[PDB]
Design a protein around this motif. Structure first.
Motif, PDB file in Angstrom:
ATOM      1  N   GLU A 106      10.590   5.012  -5.520  1.00 52.08           N
ATOM      2  CA  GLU A 106      10.891   6.371  -4.006  1.00 52.08           C
ATOM      3  C   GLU A 106      12.150   7.052  -4.666  1.00 52.08           C
ATOM      4  O   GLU A 106      11.913   8.097  -3.209  1.00 52.08           O
TER       5      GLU A 106
ATOM      6  N   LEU B 193      11.247  10.162  -3.119  1.00 53.28           N
ATOM      7  CA  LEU B 193      12.836  11.452  -2.822  1.00 53.28           C
ATOM      8  C   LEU B 193      13.033  12.546  -3.810  1.00 53.28           C
ATOM      9  O   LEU B 193      12.794  13.597  -2.659  1.00 53.28           O
TER      10      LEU B 193
ATOM     11  N   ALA C 156       6.126  14.814   1.836  1.00 55.02           N
ATOM     12  CA  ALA C 156       6.004  12.875   2.467  1.00 55.02           C
ATOM     13  C   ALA C 156       7.130  12.566   3.391  1.00 55.02           C
ATOM     14  O   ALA C 156       7.857  13.380   3.106  1.00 55.02           O
ATOM     15  N   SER C 157       7.054  11.679   3.575  1.00 58.56           N
ATOM     16  CA  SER C 157       8.070  10.827   4.276  1.00 58.56           C
ATOM     17  C   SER C 157       8.159   9.240   3.965  1.00 58.56           C
ATOM     18  O   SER C 157       7.701   9.455   3.638  1.00 58.56           O
ATOM     19  N   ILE C 158       9.364   9.043   3.575  1.00 58.08           N
ATOM     20  CA  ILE C 158       9.727   7.112   2.972  1.00 58.08           C
ATOM     21  C   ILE C 158       9.858   6.472   4.342  1.00 58.08           C
ATOM     22  O   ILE C 158      11.067   6.881   5.353  1.00 58.08           O
ATOM     23  N   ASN C 159       9.142   5.109   4.150  1.00 63.60           N
ATOM     24  CA  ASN C 159       9.820   4.282   5.263  1.00 63.60           C
ATOM     25  C   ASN C 159      10.536   3.236   4.722  1.00 63.60           C
ATOM     26  O   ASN C 159       9.396   1.877   4.366  1.00 63.60           O
ATOM     27  N   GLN C 160      11.628   2.711   4.739  1.00 58.97           N
ATOM     28  CA  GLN C 160      11.718   1.476   3.766  1.00 58.97           C
ATOM     29  C   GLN C 160      11.755   0.655   4.306  1.00 58.97           C
ATOM     30  O   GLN C 160      12.074  -0.496   4.035  1.00 58.97           O
ATOM     31  N   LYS C 161      11.720   0.455   5.963  1.00 58.77           N
ATOM     32  CA  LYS C 161      11.210  -0.826   6.919  1.00 58.77           C
ATOM     33  C   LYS C 161       9.600  -1.535   6.175  1.00 58.77           C
ATOM     34  O   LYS C 161      10.234  -2.794   5.692  1.00 58.77           O
TER      35      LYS C 161
END
Lengths: 404, 173
Positions: free
Chosen positions: A333, A337, A347-352
């Protein structure tokens, strides 16, 4: 009465034109055994700014030891004063002792270990002696060396962003050592500021200089060119066709650790690269280019993460930190980032859900910004062609290019 | 614009110098202003070339470099913790206070552009505000803050004719 004759002749020749006889007279020297030049120095420099006394200063610096007693710094001020008030085209009429004087000053500063007083001197001594900004002189190497030894890389940027297209003959002298020094120290300066796109070009220019022997600036420039190519691109870029045969026959065998490093940095395997780097630690730290190899190690992971985008569309963080060997979802992660922050990846990060989604849409070409960029590139090409046409017209009228 | 001019003046004053070595106040101002403009390379080299005697004499350079080192590792909680640990007398105060606002804006933009669902605690740590303040601040922006699960969802943020005539006149010669 020889000193009286010299000063009277200098005064008469100054403010009278005919620089040829003045240059001949000042070249008819070197017998100045009288080391009392201090009182005669600041007695004739008022008339016609500072075009004379260059030979006097060169003779003073020739001593190489005990120049002007513990007040040697005073001599420096004189040089400083001279560089601030010489001016004119009379310096360009004798552009052989000016470069020599600058070399002497640079060597004195390097030995004295204060390589920052001269950064401001061999900056007004460059644009005052060269024809135009695109003319390479033998003081660019000294300026780069001085602003490299003392870590002040910003003063040299205006003198490196210019593409040199003519080289001073300097009334003789100017061996290939100055060319190699300039195009090597500029590359090292650009590497220090993480401008790899231009450091690679500078190293390439250093390597492809015509050669018939081996020098220790074309070797430890090929070695750094390999590393910068690995950091910037994913592969060692091929040197141009017009390269000399020395690098392909003699220089290459001495650089055997770096070719092994590239070969390991040809198969995506950070563990093998780390093993090889640790095995060859002494070689990489002897050449002082340690910390440019750790950049290759840290760039292998970025290359792997970028290669992940060519196949996947949504990857779990735990799944991602198993194909690039990052040892944990948190490290993956943070890597993603950092890559997003620097613009390397889309890109995009989905912590859920703990996922990373890849977009891969840099820009659609339907805006006036791309129009402006295209216009700027075309203006650069137009200027390039105009310069090429000017050079060809200047070569067409040559009488030597009339008999053949 | 008021900081770039000061940076240029500090750089020129350091370059001229009374023998290469500059005064500690301009060194500290230079280091802090390099931290402001995200010149991590330049700040690192300035710390490298600062004389050890000046570092021993002036202890504020240690704190400024601590803040710079936290910035270099991209440690936002560390940045915010170390910013509010030292001060001077109107020499670094405005620049060290604009550093906080710059870091705040940078973190907010990064969260907006690099995330689609971020926990409330992580968002507060990135920004530095308390969790309740962090959630209640994004109200006019409409970030759709959730309850129970505490998930925050960031929201994704003439001369032409003369130019053409010049192009044609170039091509047709």
């Amino acid at each position: 009465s020889a000193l009286e004759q010299f000063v009277n002749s200098v005064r008469q020749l100054s403010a009278q034109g005919q620089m040829t006889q003045l240059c001949e007279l000042i070249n008819k020297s070197g017998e100045l055994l009288a080391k009392n030049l201090s009182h005669l120095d600041t007695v004739l420099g008022a008339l016609d700014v500072q075009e004379h006394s260059l030979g006097v200063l060169a003779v003073l610096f020739v001593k190489f030891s005990m120049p002007s007693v513990p007040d040697f710094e005073t001599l420096f001020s004189q040089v400083q004063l001279f560089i601030s008030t010489c001016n004119g085209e009379h310096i360009r009429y004798a552009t052989d002792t000016f470069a020599g004087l600058c070399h002497q000053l640079t060597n004195a500063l390097v030995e004295r270990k204060q390589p920052l007083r001269g950064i401001g001197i061999l900056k007004q001594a460059i644009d005052k002696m060269q024809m135009n900004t695109n003319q390479l002189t033998s003081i660019h190497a000294d300026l780069c060396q001085l602003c490299l030894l003392a870590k002040c890389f910003k003063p040299a940027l205006p003198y490196l962003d210019v593409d040199m297209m003519d080289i001073c003959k300097e009334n003789g002298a100017y061996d290939a050592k100055h060319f190699l020094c300039y195009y090597y120290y500029g590359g090292m300066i650009y590497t220090g500021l993480k401008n790899f796109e231009r450091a690679l070009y500078f190293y390439e220019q250093a390597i492809t200089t015509p050669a018939m022997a081996v020098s220790h600036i074309m070797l430890e420039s090929y070695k750094k060119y390999i590393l910068v190519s690995l950091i910037l691109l994913g592969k060692v870029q091929q040197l141009p066709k017009y390269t000399s045969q020395i690098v392909g026959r003699f220089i290459k065998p001495l650089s055997n650790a770096y070719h092994e490093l590239a070969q390991v940095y040809s198969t995506n395997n950070p563990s093998e690269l780390r093993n090889l780097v640790n095995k060859h630690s002494e070689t990489f730290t002897r050449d002082n280019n340690m910390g440019l190899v750790k950049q290759c190690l840290s760039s292998l992971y970025k290359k792997n993460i970028q290669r992940l985008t060519k196949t996947f569309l949504t990857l779990s963080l735990q799944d991602m930190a198993s194909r690039v060997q990052l040892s944990g979802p948190q490290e993956a992660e943070k890597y993603v980032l950092h890559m997003i922050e620097d613009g390397e990846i889309f890109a995009s990060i989905n912590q859920k859900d703990g996922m990373v989604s890849f977009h891969d849409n840099p820009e659609k070409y339907n805006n006036p910004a791309m129009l402006h960029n295209i216009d700027q590139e075309m203006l650069k090409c137009i200027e390039l062609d105009e310069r090429l046409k000017a050079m060809d017209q200047e070569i067409t009228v040559n009488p030597q290019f009339v008999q053949k | 614009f008021s900081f770039k001019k000061l940076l240029d003046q500090c750089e020129n004053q350091e370059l001229e110098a009374p023998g290469g070595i500059a005064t500690p106040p301009v060194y500290g101002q230079l280091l802090a202003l390099y931290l402001l403009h995200n010149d991590m390379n330049n700040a690192r080299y300035l710390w490298k070339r600062i004389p050890p005697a000046i570092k021993s004499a002036n202890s504020e350079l240690g704190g400024i470099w601590s803040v710079g080192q936290r910035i270099w590792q991209r440690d936002f909680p560390g940045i915010y913790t170390t910013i509010n640990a030292h001060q001077w007398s109107e020499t670094v105060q405005p620049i060290m206070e604009a550093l906080r606002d710059a870091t705040r804006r940078r973190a907010f933009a990064l969260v907006s552009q690099a995330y689609t669902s971020i926990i409330a605690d992580d968002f507060a740590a990135f920004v530095g505000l308390p969790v309740e303040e962090a959630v209640k601040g994004i109200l006019e922006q409409g970030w759709q803050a959730d309850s129970t699960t505490r998930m925050v969802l960031p929201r994704k943020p003439e001369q032409q004719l003369a130019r053409l005539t010049d192009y044609v006149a170039f091509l047709e010669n």
